[PDB]
Write the structure tokens for this entry.
Amino acid sequence: LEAEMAVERKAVEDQRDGELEARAQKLEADLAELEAEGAKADARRKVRDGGEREMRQIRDRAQRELDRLEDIWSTFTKLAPKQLIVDENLYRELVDRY
């Protein structure tokens, strides 16, 4: 069980890393395209802030997925009778996956 869901964790963290790398590459390409234009300092700061906030939001969503899966891991390992799952989404994920 540890082996199978360790490879499962490898797969989820790998798709998370792939999403992060793809988004980072897209943002880097956009930033380089902007730098090619050599816009004003005000425009440079505006676009840099926009891209930084977009990357922060992407990382926040990735961390949301990661902590969702970490809660899944804790609930499955720390699984015993007489336990409650208030959020039906969590239980649906558990049953559909495991």
In short: The radius of gyration is 19 Å.
